[model samples]
Target: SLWQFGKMINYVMGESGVLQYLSYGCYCGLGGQGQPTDATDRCCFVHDCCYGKVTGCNPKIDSYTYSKKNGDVVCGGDNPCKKQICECDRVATTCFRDNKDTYDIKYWFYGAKNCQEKSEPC
Candidate 1:
């Protein structure tokens, strides 16, 4: 019954709202990098970053030496990755980043709804 009513409505349903965030959802058949731009949490990933390969891979890695500890969901890498093994020396996954890159990578982004939902801030 006050101006706060309008403000609360927008706040709860803003582009950055909880439902909006979850709405970004998944691309169903799209792979990691295949996500449309709106899902800024990810789209493309870097080689040396380790996020692209084991972290975002499809087949998954639970015991990867670089796997995140303490029950983390994100992160992965072969032990050799930390050792700076060159791509040619490393094996690629069947459905993920090859982890063979030895060079810095450049990425691209696009225009899409910057939607969001919330739980807690990172």
Candidate 2:
């Protein structure tokens, strides 16, 4: 049901070429990230041309200092967009919203680990 809703919303706006405009204005605008340069650039370009929106893109990477029962460990921190677990949670939350452009969009996926191809035992 959650995935279905996401799909439906995505189809309405995300597929209709509105999310790309917002993303470009948000990230590629003058005050934003100033346009994708590396992998993100390629991804945005491809998505813009095909899906009419930026669907899958890597998150901004940052160094994170997390302290758990295992002790303090310095690891990389990436936004939720880079992880499938977080995506599932995000979808469950229905974080998508209609932007000022009148197109539904989801940008709340943040603060999560990078998704790995294989699951690791805890």
Candidate 3:
């Protein structure tokens, strides 16, 4: 059921609803910067922003992974974009002009994913 829901979201977004948004140039921002300008651009942008950035939610914190067999650990550097973390989990994430601000525009499906994935990584 969960997978189905994911698929349904993909269908409604990839095939149906996104098309309408594109026609109106809604998501790319009021002037179109926020939305993709073409089909290919839209598809790639959606894939990256939705699946990669938003949902991954990998923080920029520097950490290490240890391999016991090799008796070694690999350290990592901080995330390049340390300030903004993508929130692509499709869990009603929100954004505001400033952290202290309260009002925000609510997005659905792809829009939500897009916002979340902006600062996210694969």
> Which regions in candidate 1 have their CA more than 4 angstroms from the true location?
1-24, 27-35, 39-59, 66-78, 81-122
- Residue pairs with clashing backbones, model 3: 28-34, 28-35, 53-120, 54-88, 54-117, 55-88
Tens digits of per-residue lDDT, candidate 1, 31-92, equal 23233332222211222233234323322222232222332222235544432322211221
RMSD of 2: 16.8
Give lDDT tens digits, candidate 2, residues 1-122. 22332333344335533334324322221113233333322333332332222136522221222222221122223643334322322221222222333322332121112221232211
Give all candidates' CA lDDT scores. 0.24, 0.28, 0.28
- Range of the 10 consecutive residues with the lowest summed lDDT in candidate 3: 91-100
Residues 1-122 of candidate 3 have per-residue lDDT tens digits of 12322322233343342332322222322112254434433433343354334222343231222112231212222543221222221111111111113222232123533443233222
RMSD of each: 17.4, 16.8, 14.7
Residue pairs with backbone atoms closer than 3 Å in model 1 (clashes):
17-117, 18-117, 18-118, 20-116, 21-116, 21-117, 87-100
Regions more than 4 Å wrong, model 3:
1-6, 9-37, 55-122
Pairs that clash in candidate 2: none
State which candidate, 1 or 3, has the greater lDDT: 3
Lowest summed lDDT across 10 adjacent residues in model 1 is found at 88-97
Worst 10 residues of 2 by lDDT: 108-117
